[PDB]
Each structure stands twice: as structure tokens, then as C-alpha cells.
Amino acid sequence: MISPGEFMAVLGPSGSGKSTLLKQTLKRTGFVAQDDLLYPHLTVRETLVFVALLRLPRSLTRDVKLRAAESVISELGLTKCENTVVGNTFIRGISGGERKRVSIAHELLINPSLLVLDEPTSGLDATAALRLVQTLAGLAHGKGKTVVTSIHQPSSRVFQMFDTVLLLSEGKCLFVGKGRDAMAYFESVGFSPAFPMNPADFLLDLAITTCIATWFSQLCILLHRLLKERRHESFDLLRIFQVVAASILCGLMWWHSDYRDVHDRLGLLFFISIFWGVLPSFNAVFTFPQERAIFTRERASGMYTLSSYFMAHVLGSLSMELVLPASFLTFTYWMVYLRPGIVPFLLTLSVLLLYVLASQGLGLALGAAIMDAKKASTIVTVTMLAFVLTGGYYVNKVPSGMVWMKYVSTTFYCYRLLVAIQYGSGEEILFVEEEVIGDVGMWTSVGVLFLMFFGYRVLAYLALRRI
């Protein structure tokens, strides 16, 4: 039993059952886990106001939501670090204490009366944990919040701040009540310390239109939230360097490529298709396993739906996955001197953008299907290799009983589209018939690529819904 405004600490050794022990009631109940599953690119204020808009009811406007988020940030002592990104182990951001306080404010925006916390002071410095428990006690007492927390091991100053201590050991309960008399209770049984020591250490030793409006609003919200995530890969130094190196390589190798040498242009188009099939799919396959945990945690509270998250993710990724291929095509066309014309330029640009979107959708679907990031990446690589080997440029004599594979590979279709844009039906050129004219036309290839992209998105959505 816990009274409102009382601070309870769940004490016990590792594996004693502290984690497992911890609709209107759930609405006012805020649960915080040990892991700080937060986006590392959003700053403090940005993240808390986003959670405020994504969790608070629609009867509250955006300006007052921002004001409430700012008040929560200032109440948790995050004013100094409000101008810094959250960060993670990879990219430097706020400290561990600030990150844990941001995680607390994530559930504090709903204004919960029953705050359950699993290991908040675990894994941080003595002073950071001391400040965290000071803040938690202040919220519990001054604001009258029913706070139940679990700590693997508290410090002395940390230990002396809980008004209630509940003791677990190997799944059973040993003591419940105030921390001050606890030793006395043990002194009732005959367990007295043999030396000056922290009483916490003894404890361990002894142990319809509205729905559409909400959908659109939260979809735009999640899209704006993931713009920050996409901005990293938009200007990733390694990615930009690789893209510009490939562009310069294509420009120099095919410098002022003529229309007479069909083989050189065919190889250039096939290489472009290979690059823009492998890179987007490989990039997209990593996101879904990486954000799976945070998506599950956020969906458990019911803050947002799966379809809105998926649409926001694809909308955010479209700009990142289209900015680079456009510049790559601009540089390559203006360096290697492919077929002149603004209309062919727009046609090939749209063709490659559609192919890149299809490859990104395939990568997202494969990442959704496989719960392991490395195995999903391996499957993506294998599928892309099987596709490129069936693109019509490496092998010209496909076995009769196997041809259906080249009818499902997107890189095939992209290569045929590129060849059609560069030379048409081969009337000017007229091996030519099989490598230029092809067996699949312009509009049918475009429709097949669009259908493949849409099907990949649908399959990814089905895989996400399966879990």
C-alpha cells in the first residue's frame, strides 16, 4: 500500500524481481523504464514539446502545450541543457543525469499522479543520482505525486530520502514500510550491523472527420520529428563523400561519352542502377530494427498509431533519399554528356527517383520482416545481388525455366528505363535488339516499378502489423 505524496524505493538485489513487480488509471499512470529510448538528434525542448503534442489531448492548443512543456523542463532542472541535443553513445549530447531527467519529463508531460520508475539512478555518478533523487522527492512531496521507484543500490544520502522502502528477495517480500525503522525492525529479529555501514547495503545483504484530423495532425507531427533524424544522413560526411566520389568517378570515366559506343553507356547506366539499388536499400534496412524498441515503447502507451508513424517515416525519408540521386544525376549527365535535352533529363531523373524509392521500400520491408538488423542487411545484400545478376547486362542468355526472376528484379526495370530514355527503341542505333529494344516497354516498366514500390511499402506495413 502506498499513500499519495509518499516516495517508495523498491530495494533488492539483481534478479530479485524488482522489474517484474513494477484505462483511466493507466492514463494517469506514468511508467519509466531503465533504458532511455530517445531520439539522439532532437534537442531537449524539441523532444519534450513533441511528446507534449503527441500525448496531450487535442482540446489543448499548441501554444499552451509548448508553455506546459517549457514549464516541465524548467521544473526538472533542464534549463541549462535545453540548447543541447539528447545524444547517445554514438553522438555526444546531454549527460546521463540530463538524459534521465528528459526521460522522466517524457512521462511527466501527461501530469501523472502514479509515477513508476525502474532503475532511474542506476548507471550514473553519485552527484547525478543525488540530484535525481532530490528532484524525485521534490515532485513526490511538493506536488503530491504517488512515486514508486526501484534502485539496484542507493547511496547513503540517496537512501535517506525515501519515506517508504519495500524489500524483495528472490521474488518474495521481506519488509515494507519506512526506511528509518527498517533497521529497528531487523533489530527486532536480531540482525545488527557489526560496523558503521549504509543501511541500504544491509537491505541488499539481508535480501470520422475527427479521426482523420488527428491522423493528419500526428502524421505531420511525427514527420517533423523525424526530419531531425533524416538531416543526419542528408549531410553525413561519409555518405556525401561516397556520393560525390561516385559522381566524379562517373564523370571522369565516361567524360564526353559518345552515342556511338553503346556498350560504354549501357555499362554506365547499369552501374548507376547498381549503386542506387544497393545504397538506398542498405540504408533503409537499418532504420527499422534500430527504431523498433522505441516504436514499441511509444505504441504501448498508445500515443500514436502504426500507420501514421509509417507514413511520417517514409515522408521524412523521401527528401533524404531524393536529394542525393538528383545531384548525382545532374553532375553525371553534365560531365559525361549523355543524350541532350531538358525533357530527357527530367524523364531520367524521375525514373531514377522512382527506382530509388522502390529500393528504399524493399529495404524497409526486408528490415521489417527480419527482427535482426545484421541478418536483414545480409538478406538485402543477397536479394540485391540476385537482382543485379539478372539485370539483363551481365548475362544475356537467361535459362528458360528461370526467366521469371528477371521479371521481379527492380534493377532490371531501372536499367531498361534508363536505356529507353538514352536511346529509345534503338532506331538511331539500328546484340542491339536484345540489349536496347528489350522485351518490356516504357509505360509498363514504369507501372511495374511503381507497383513494386507500393507493394514493398504494403509488405513492410504488414510486417510491422504482424508484431
Q: Which is nearer to a copy of itself, 310 or 412 (CB)?
A: 412
Select the binding partner of residue 245 from a copy of itself, ligand A8S, none (C-beta < 5 to 8 A, by kind): a copy of itself
Residues numbered 388 to 417 that lie near ligand A8S (CB under 6 A) are: 388
Question: Alpha-carbon torsion 67, 94, 319, 209, what sign?
Answer: negative
Q: Which is nearer to ligand A8S, 159 or 275 (CB)?
A: 275
Q: Do the strands 146-150 and 114-118 form a parallel or antiparallel pair, or are they unpaired?
A: parallel
286 lies in the site for ligand A8S, by CB under 6 A: no
Question: Residue 446: CB partners within 8 Å, gap ≥ 6?
Answer: 351, 354, 417
Q: Which is nearer to ligand A8S, 147 or 274 (CB)?
A: 274
- Comparing CA positions, the residue from 333, 309, 323 lying closest to residue 465 is 309
Q: Which is nearer to a copy of itself, 359 or 377 (CB)?
A: 377
Minimum gap (Å) between residue 421 Cβ and a copy of itself: 19
381 lies in the site for ligand A8S, by CB under 6 A: yes
Distance separating alpha carbons of residues 109 and 51, to the nearest angstrom: 8
Check whether 307 is labelled as a binding-site residue.
Answer: no
* Alpha helices (H) along 337-371: 342-369
Check whether 251 is labelled as a binding-site residue.
Answer: no
Chosen residue from 384, 448, 452, 460 binding ligand A8S by CB under 6 A: 384
Distance separating alpha carbons of residues 359 and 391, to the nearest angstrom: 14
Question: Residue 66: CB partners within 8 Å, gap ≥ 6?
Answer: 49, 52
Minimum gap (Å) between residue 243 Cβ and ligand A8S: 12
Give the interface with a copy of itself as residue ranges (CB under 8 A): 13-14, 125-127, 153, 155-157, 159-160, 183, 193, 195-199, 201-202, 204-205, 237-239, 241-242, 245-246, 249-250, 252-255, 257-258, 261, 263-264, 267-268, 270-271, 374-375, 377-378, 381-382, 385-386, 389-390, 393-399, 401-402, 431
Q: Which helix (H) or strand (E) holds 7?
A: strand 7-11
Question: Beta-carbon neighbour count of residue 8 at 10 Å?
Answer: 23
Minimum gap (Å) between residue 93 Cβ and a copy of itself: 18
Task: Give me the phi and psi of 8, to 5 degrees please.
Answer: -110, 135
Minimum gap (Å) between residue 79 Cβ and a copy of itself: 23
Q: Which is nearer to ligand A8S, 51 or 384 (CB)?
A: 384
Q: Which is nearer to ligand A8S, 98 or 321 (CB)?
A: 321
Chosen residue from 197, 249, 306, 385 binding ligand A8S by CB under 6 A: 385
Distance separating alpha carbons of residues 383 and 411, to the nearest angstrom: 11
CA distances from 119 to 22, 73, 127, 151 (A): 11, 21, 16, 5
Q: Do the strands 164-169 and 172-177 form a parallel or antiparallel pair, or are they unpaired?
A: antiparallel
Provide the annotated binding site: 12-19
Write out the residues near ligand A8S by the rule CB under 6 A: 274, 278, 282, 381, 384-385, 388
